[PDB]
């Protein structure tokens, strides 16, 4: 019997998801360490899955007896519990990713928002809207019995049988799959962008003229220069597309000019064509220009200057004319440890002086720039260094999202085809429905197994609890 196989599968899924999701609800409530923001969202996934793995034995016995014998009260609780598992589950996963977005993309502007009282308040809102969403299931859960006396537990819609069917699946498809995945996946888009634009991606090594310029392209944002020159050179690492909100970080392990050299951030806009500098250290010559004012940023104090370069080479060609905005520190910045340039502060300052930058952002790099000199410099460059702790958690949610999509999409795909349908179901199609549904039920015993493979903290808690051996 395909019932025999199906009943067996139901039952092993249930056994495994009960162990899996009880352990997960345990370790989070039993350890202080395990109570975290992501974990608070995770507990509710496990609660919903647990609630559901409890109803499964009844559904298993329906398949094995081809008959619902438990009564109308237990049917209502199983349908509510099966519905909870379809909507509360992913509604927990959407809130989980929005949380991931906010903590990577906007770590600064939503720290107050990311507190456990707000997680707990939010997670009582995840239930309220699930129960609102599954109200058709709750209200209309009941027994339908065929002419041969066998009752099946289902949702007896009030009208004609398929009338509410096409209505219902499209409701469920839109609430339980479309809208939440639309939300989820663009959360990870914007996260991919902030992760991808954090490190430097542009290497510049432009030696004009005579002398010696040995430029080294190291790992990450590292580079060094060794020069004793007679020309002009610019070496540095940065971003092919600059930003007026990027806060640039760097560390100049060596900044030893003998002669004319600048340590400086610099870049271009077009529309209008402007080259800009934020100079932090120099050699024997502090660059100036037409004085304009001062700005205080990142501990230190800079003068603002403008210059105009006539018939000079630019990113727009060999013979353009353009303005240059400068922020030159009034004294040489100490070197050797992590130093920040909060670029906005310079943009705002130039703006208040009527120096506006362009619409169209070209490159933006943290360069060593020498002018007929010698010297050495070693500089590492970056922007918004990621927290390794946070990386692994954002990786785990991404994969829990992945298995969910994998385990449920054949189901919504099977359900949406089935409205168009014109022929009565075939055994092959019937066996496909039961496989596709088993795929969804299996989803609620994966999450825990994944927590043990993708979270170290979950792995040791599981080992602590089941008295296993911790061997570094």
């Amino acid at each position: 019997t395909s019932n025999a196989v199906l009943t067996f599968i139901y039952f092993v899924v249930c056994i495994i998801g009960l162990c899996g999701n009880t352990l997960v609800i345990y370790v989070i409530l039993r350890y202080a360490k395990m109570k975290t923001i992501t974990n608070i969202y995770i507990l509710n996934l496990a609660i919903a899955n647990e609630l559901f793995m409890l109803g499964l034995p009844f559904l298993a016995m329906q398949v094995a007896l081809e008959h619902w014998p438990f009564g109308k009260a237990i049917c209502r609780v199983v349908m509510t519990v099966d519905g909870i598992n379809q909507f509360t589950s992913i509604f927990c996963l959407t809130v989980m990713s929005i949380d991931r977005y906010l903590a990577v993309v906007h770590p600064i502007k939503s720290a107050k928002w990311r507190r456990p009282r707000t997680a707990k308040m939010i997670t009582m809102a995840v239930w309220g809207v699930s129960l609102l969403v599954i109200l058709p299931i709750m209200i209309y859960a009941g027994l339908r019995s065929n002419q041969w006396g066998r009752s099946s537990c289902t949702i007896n819609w009030p009208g004609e049988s398929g009338a509410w069917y096409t209505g219902f699946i499209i409701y469920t498809f839109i609430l339980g799959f479309l809208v939440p995945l639309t939300i989820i996946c663009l959360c990870y888009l914007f996260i991919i962008i902030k992760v991808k634009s954090a490190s430097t991606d542009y290497w510049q090594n432009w030696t004009f003229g005579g002398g010696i310029v040995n430029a080294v392209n190291g790992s990450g944002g590292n580079y060094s220069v060794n020069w004793s020159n007679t020309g002009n050179f610019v070496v540095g690492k940065g971003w092919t597309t600059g930003s007026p909100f990027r806060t640039i970080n760097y560390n100049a392990g060596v900044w030893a000019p003998n002669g004319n050299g600048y340590l400086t951030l610099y870049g271009w806009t077009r529309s209008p064509l402007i080259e800009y500098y934020v100079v932090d250290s120099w050699g024997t010559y502090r660059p100036t220009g037409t004085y304009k004012g001062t700005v205080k940023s990142d501990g230190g104090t800079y003068d603002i200057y403008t210059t105009t370069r006539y018939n000079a080479p630019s990113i727009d060609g060999d013979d353009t004319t353009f303005t240059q905005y400068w922020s030159v520190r009034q004294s040489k910045r100490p070197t050797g440890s992590n130093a920040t340039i909060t670029f906005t502060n310079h943009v705002n300052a130039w703006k208040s002086h009527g120096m506006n930058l362009g619409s169209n952002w070209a490159y933006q790099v943290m360069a060593t720039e020498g002018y007929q000199s010698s010297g050495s410099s070693n500089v590492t460059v970056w922007s918004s260094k990621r927290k390794k702790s946070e990386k692994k958690v954002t990786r785990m949610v991404s994969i829990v999202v992945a298995v969910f999509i994998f385990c449920w999409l054949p189901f919504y795909i099977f359900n949406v085809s089935s409205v168009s349908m014109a022929i009565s179901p075939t055994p092959a199609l019937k066996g496909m429905f039961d496989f596709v549904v088993v795929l969804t039920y299996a989803n609620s015993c994966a999450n825990p197994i994944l927590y043990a493979f993708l979270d170290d903290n979950f792995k040791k808690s599981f080992q602590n609890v089941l008295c296993l051996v911790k061997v570094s």
Partner: peptide, 8 residues
């Protein structure tokens, strides 16, 4: 379709 998330 079937009766609910099962075709027997």
């Amino acid at each position: 379709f079937x009766y609910x998330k099962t075709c027997x």
